[PDB]
Amino acid sequence: WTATSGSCKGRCFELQEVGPPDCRCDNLCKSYSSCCHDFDELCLKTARGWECTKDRCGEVRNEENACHCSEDCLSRGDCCTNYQVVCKGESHWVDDDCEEIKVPECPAGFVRPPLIIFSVDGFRASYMKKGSKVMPNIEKLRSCGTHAPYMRPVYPTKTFPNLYTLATGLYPESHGIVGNSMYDPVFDASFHLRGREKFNHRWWGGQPLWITATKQGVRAGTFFWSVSIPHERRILTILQWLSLPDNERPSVYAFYSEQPDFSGHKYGPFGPEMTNPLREIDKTVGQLMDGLKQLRLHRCVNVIFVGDHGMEDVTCDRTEFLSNYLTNVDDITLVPGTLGRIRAKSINNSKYDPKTIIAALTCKKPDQHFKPYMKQHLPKRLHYANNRRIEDIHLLVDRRWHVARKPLDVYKKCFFQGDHGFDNKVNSMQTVFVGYGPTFKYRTKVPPFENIELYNVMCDLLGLKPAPNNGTHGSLNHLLRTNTFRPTMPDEVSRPNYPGIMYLQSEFDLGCTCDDKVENKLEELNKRLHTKGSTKERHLLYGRPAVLYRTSYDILYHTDFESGYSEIFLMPLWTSYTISKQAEVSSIPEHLTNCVRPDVRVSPGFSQNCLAYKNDKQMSYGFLFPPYLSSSPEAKYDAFLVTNMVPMYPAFKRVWAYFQRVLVKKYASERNGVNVISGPIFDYNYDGLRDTEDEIKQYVEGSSIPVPTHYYSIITSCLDFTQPADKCDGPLSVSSFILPHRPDNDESCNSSEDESKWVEELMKMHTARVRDIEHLTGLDFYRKTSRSYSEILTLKTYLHTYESE
Numbered sequence: 001w002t003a004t005s006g007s008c009k010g011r012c013f014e015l016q017e018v019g020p021p022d023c024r025c026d027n028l029c030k031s032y033s034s035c036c037h038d039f040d041e042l043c044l045k046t047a048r049g050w051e052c053t054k055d056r057c058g059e060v061r062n063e064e065n066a067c068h069c070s071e072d073c074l075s076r077g078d079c080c081t082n083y084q085v086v087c088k089g090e091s092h093w094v095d096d097d098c099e100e101i102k103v104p105e106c107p108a109g110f111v112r113p114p115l116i117i118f119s120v121d122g123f124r125a126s127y128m129k130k131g132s133k134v135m136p137n138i139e140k141l142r143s144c145g146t147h148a149p150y151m152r153p154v155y156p157t158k159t160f161p162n163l164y165t166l167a168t169g170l171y172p173e174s175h176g177i178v179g180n181s182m183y184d185p186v187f188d189a190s191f192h193l194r195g196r197e198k199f200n201h202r203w204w205g206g207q208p209l210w211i212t213a214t215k216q217g218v219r220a221g222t223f224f225w226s227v228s229i230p231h232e233r234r235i236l237t238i239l240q241w242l243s244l245p246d247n248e249r250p251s252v253y254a255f256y257s258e259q260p261d262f263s264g265h266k267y268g269p270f271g272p273e274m275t276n277p278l279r280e281i282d283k284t285v286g287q288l289m290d291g292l293k294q295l296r297l298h299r300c301v302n303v304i305f306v307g308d309h310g311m312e313d314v315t316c317d318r319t320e321f322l323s324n325y326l327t328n329v330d331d332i333t334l335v336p337g338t339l340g341r342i343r344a345k346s347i348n349n350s351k352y353d354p355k356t357i358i359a360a361l362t363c364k365k366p367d368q369h370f371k372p373y374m375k376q377h378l379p380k381r382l383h384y385a386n387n388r389r390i391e392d393i394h395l396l397v398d399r400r401w402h403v404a405r406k407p408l409d410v411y412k413k414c415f416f417q418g419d420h421g422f423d424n425k426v427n428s429m430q431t432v433f434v435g436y437g438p439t440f441k442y443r444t445k446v447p448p449f450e451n452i453e454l455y456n457v458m459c460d461l462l463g464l465k466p467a468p469n470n471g472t473h474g475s476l477n478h479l480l481r482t483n484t485f486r487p488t489m490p491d492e493v494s495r496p497n498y499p500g501i502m503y504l505q506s507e508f509d510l511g512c513t514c515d516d517k518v519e520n521k522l523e524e525l526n527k528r529l530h531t532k533g534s535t536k537e538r539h540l541l542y543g544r545p546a547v548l549y550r551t552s553y554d555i556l557y558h559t560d561f562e563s564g565y566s567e568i569f570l571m572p573l574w575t576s577y578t579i580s581k582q583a584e585v586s587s588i589p590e591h592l593t594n595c596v597r598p599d600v601r602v603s604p605g606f607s608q609n610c611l612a613y614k615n616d617k618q619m620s621y622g623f624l625f626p627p628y629l630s631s632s633p634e635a636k637y638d639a640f641l642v643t644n645m646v647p648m649y650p651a652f653k654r655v656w657a658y659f660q661r662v663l664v665k666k667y668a669s670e671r672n673g674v675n676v677i678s679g680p681i682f683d684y685n686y687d688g689l690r691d692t693e694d695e696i697k698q699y700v701e702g703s704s705i706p707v708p709t710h711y712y713s714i715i716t717s718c719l720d721f722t723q724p725a726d727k728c729d730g731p732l733s734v735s736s737f738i739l740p741h742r743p744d745n746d747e748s749c750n751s752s753e754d755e756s757k758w759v760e761e762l763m764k765m766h767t768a769r770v771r772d773i774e775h776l777t778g779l780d781f782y783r784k785t786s787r788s789y790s791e792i793l794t795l796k797t798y799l800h801t802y803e804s805e
């Protein structure tokens with residue numbers, strides 16, 4: 001019930017929300033069917049339109065007008081945005097030359113430059129170039145301010161997940177808005193686009209920017225706009241709020257546009273119908289900037305022009321139907337479209353089996369346009385699993401396609417030409433970022449970055465301490481002229497042991513053998529030097545990784561590689577080695593094929609054993625530093641130490657062996673040498689965070705050797721590839737991956753072919769940021785470089801995407 005008989009008289013677009021049954025006058029009351037009876041008349045005036053014309057100049061104020069051209073309008077804060085232009089000989093903001101904003105130029109009583117977030121739904125990154133002719137205001141913001149070529153959205157590349165990631169700095173699995181549609185089994189409640197459930201606060205986790213601001217004494221405009229409020233009214237409402245007295249005036253505001261997403265769905269991303277929507281957004285930007293100029297705020301306000309996701313060409317004829325795959329189609333519920341999520345239709349049906357559903361969906365047709373995954377097998381860069389609202393079974397849908405349950409769903413639910421939702425690495429889903437204002441840099445282009453980073457910067461722009469989130473605070477310092485956040489490196493928690501030779505060979509009873517007895521002060525001085533770290537500078541280029549949790553581990557030096565060996569997990573946490581452009585690949589000699597060697601620096605009790613691998617019929621083993629890359633026959637023996645060995649399913653060894661034998665050398669060739677850090681990851685509860693030992697669900701049979709869920713590598717070289725990786729004077733270049741450690745290659749439909757046809761494609765799909773590896777390992781990389789710490793944070797958030805330009 002709402003007592004709609006109250007009135008909006010002097011309450012139009014009020015900032016405090018009133019609770020039922022009192023009637024509302026705020027910018028969301030329409031959406032709730034709760035506005036006062038006189039809201040339209042009072043608050044949504046339209047008379048005479050939105051622009052001053054010469055004849056209205058100095059009019060007598062008529063309060064019926066949508067906006068005003070009378071002399072008192074600047075004091076009242078409610079002129080038409082073109083008032084000064086038409087009536088006072090002023091120029092439109094877009095016509096003025098740009099001039100650097102070195103310091104905020106604000107009216108008296110402004111405590112800080114306000115922040116205005118101008119968000120545009122469906123605004124694809126390439127519209128900045130392709131549409132540039134018809135967007136002069138947006139083009140001026142972009143060229144005069146700070147801009148990225150694109151900004152990466154979160155997965156799924158849907159509206160609400162992305163807008164709420166913008167507002168919180170959190171992945172969707174952590175903020176809880178994991179799609180535009182959801183079922184929460186604990187609430188037994190469903191969230192949808194249409195309806196009222198979605199307004200219930202229990203869906204919405206984390207702490208969005210408006211709440212962060214309010215808790216710390218910074219007032220916020222209400223960010224959400226009901227759809228029938230016209231854009232011109234939204235802009236005039238923001239500008240009016242900006243004329244409130246100091247004590248009442250918000251410092252942060254948002255505007256939202258349903259365009260260009262609305263028309264992109266109907267016409268496709270580049271339909272000729274798309275020009276008009278882009279012109280219209282531009283005109284809205286021009287209204288805002290003109291309105292700020294009138295208020296003397298155009299060199300005071302920081303403006304962020306930001307999109308949520310792009311738009312791809314997708315048509316009804318490109319739908320895959322689960323009825324072409326599953327016999328039991330009526331026993332499942334599908335969340336359909338540009339992603340798939342599958343769960344059981346009834347929890348009372350115990351003949352529902354996810355394994356047989358996955359199998360029926362796996363590489364069943366030559367051209368199949370979606371790939372099924374248990375959510376924990378999805379690429380870790382998507383961070384899309386650790387939420388009860390995310391169904392165990394997921395379908396990653398190819399760009400340009402939909403998945404649906406049955407054909408009748410597509411014509412009794414073509415009607416559309418664009419859609420979005422796909423993998424957040426897809427070019428068509430990339431969106432835009434421009435920052436313009438005193439706090440942003442002048443005419444500066446910055447590299448693409450991820451939208452989870454923006455919340456931190458929005459907090460910096462408003463002098464707020466960000467709530468805990470998934471941005472890496474400091475990684476976007478290079479966007480800002482001032483207000484940078486000067487992070488310190490985390491403190492190492494565990495210091496390493498440096499074991500010398502402490503064990504005789506016969507103390508080990510590991511069931512390992514090696515043909516290594518084939519056997520000098522010239523050479524013997526040298527090997528001692530190597531075991532004490534004499535080549536450490538060559539193989540450990542950026543310092544040892546810091547261990548940021550409590551653990552027991554040893555640093556182990558060798559000719560060709562250095563490792564941080566965990567006595568708790570019985571394997572290295574990290575292995576570090578450098579491969580020059582000139583390095584040679586060799587084979588594993590015939591006599592050494594099954595060689596494993598006890599490491600006399602590490603107790604038997606803290607070593608793996610070969611008997612466990614013999615007894616475990618499913619599990620084999622691999623090496624972190626690859627024997628193929630040994631610098632010499634004698635050095636090669638180091639690669640077979642039991643302390644360089646890790647458990648690997650045979651299927652995964654096909655992947656690993658190809659990476660180590662072929663690809664590392666290819667990279668050293670292309671990049672002028674590479675430094676590699678490889679190691680295991682254990683994320684059995686799929687939370688993106690390192691597992692403690694009591695979370696491990698699987699061990700090599702009969703032993704305490706834990707089995708990794710994933711293997712990572714960080715591959716660093718010099719950004720200026722004219723310098724070799726080990727003598728780089730400036731910025732670095734990095735690519736990384738987190739490969740899932742699986743007992744089959746069912747993910748790779750071409751896996752029966754030679755590794756050269758499928759392995760690198762797998763690795764590309766599992767590309768990662770150094771930062772993703774840091775969360776999964778509790779390690780901190782790049783601690784000793786000649787680079788600024790902020791620049792290193794940016795490197796650590798880098799994702800190498802493999803998309804074309």
Ligand SMILES: *[C@@H]1O[C@H](CO)[C@@H](O[C@@H]2O[C@H](CO)[C@@H](O[C@@H]3O[C@H](CO[C@H]4O[C@H](CO)[C@@H](O)[C@H](O[C@H]5O[C@H](CO)[C@@H](O)[C@H](O)[C@@H]5O[C@H]5O[C@H](CO)[C@@H](O)[C@H](O)[C@@H]5O)[C@@H]4O)[C@@H](O)[C@H](O[C@H]4O[C@H](CO)[C@@H](O)[C@H](O)[C@@H]4O[C@H]4O[C@H](CO)[C@@H](O)[C@H](O)[C@@H]4O)[C@@H]3O)[C@H](O)[C@H]2NC(C)=O)[C@H](O)[C@H]1NC(C)=O
Nearest residue numbers: 173174175176204205206386387388468469470687688775
């Ligand atoms: C991205 O950034 C985010 C934010 O920094 C990172 O997420 C954080 O990770 C922390 C570590 O996992 C986690 O800390 C836990 O918090 C528990 C208290 O949680 C409540 O309070 C906070 C603070 O306001 C609030 O934010 C939480 O909100 C969550 O929950 C509701 C849903 O219930 C949602 O509205 C919201 O969306 C959010 O959900 C997300 O997180 C939860 C987990 O909290 C997931 O279940 C969801 O899927 C969703 O992703 C909460 O309202 C606290 O109680 C925990 O402490 C337990 O564990 C420690 C171990 O050290 C132990 O000391 C304690 O005793 C306790 O154990 C007890 O519970 C156990 C499990 O139930 C049980 O086994 C034991 O026997 C004990 O009884 C813990 O400290 C923090 O909450 C989240 N924060 C957020 C916002 O998500 C995220 O990790 C980053 N991602 C990456 C990859 O880096």
Ligand SMILES: CC(=O)N(CCCCn1ccnc1)Cc1ccc(Nc2ccc(C(C)C)cc2)nc1
Nearest residue numbers: 117119121159163166167223224225254255256261
């Ligand atoms: C009410 C409603 O349902 N919508 C969404 C329609 C989805 C349509 N759609 C479906 C498929 N494709 C497109 C409208 C909406 C959205 C955001 C918003 N304000 C806002 C501004 C800034 C921010 C961040 C940037 C801080 C967050 C929120 N006001 C209104």
Ligand SMILES: [Ca+2]
Nearest residue numbers: 683689690691
């Ligand atoms: Ca974990």
Ligand SMILES: [Cl-]
Nearest residue numbers: 158179180181
């Ligand atoms: Cl969805």
Ligand SMILES: [K+]
Nearest residue numbers: 613616619620
């Ligand atoms: K075995």
Ligand SMILES: [Zn+2]
Nearest residue numbers: 122159261265
């Ligand atoms: Zn859309």
